[PDB]
Amino acid sequence: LNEKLKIEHAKKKRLFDLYINGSYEVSELDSMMNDIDAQINYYEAQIEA
Amino acid sequence: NEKLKIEHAKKKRLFDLYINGSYEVSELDSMMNDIDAQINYYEAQIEA
């Protein structure tokens, strides 16, 4: 499950890279980045809280 | 050389993220460091 949380972290690094590569724009980046950042919050604690 | 200008564009997009209150500066600076690192290596190639 730790990796499953690291997955959410792994997305950020790639998502930034994708945007940086010119694949995505800021507008679409924001909603996605926020959703994934939100997504982390759902899978943040639970196992250890 | 046609190797930095792509990084220049890469570095350009990263700078825009700094204006929004979102994201984390640590994430941006760390990537920026990686971006800038490739440049300095790319630059000093003429002498060798």
From TrEMBL, chain A:
It comes from the Bacteria. The gene is int. This is Integrase [Bacteriophage A118]. It comes from Listeria innocua serovar 6a (strain ATCC BAA-680 / CLIP 11262).
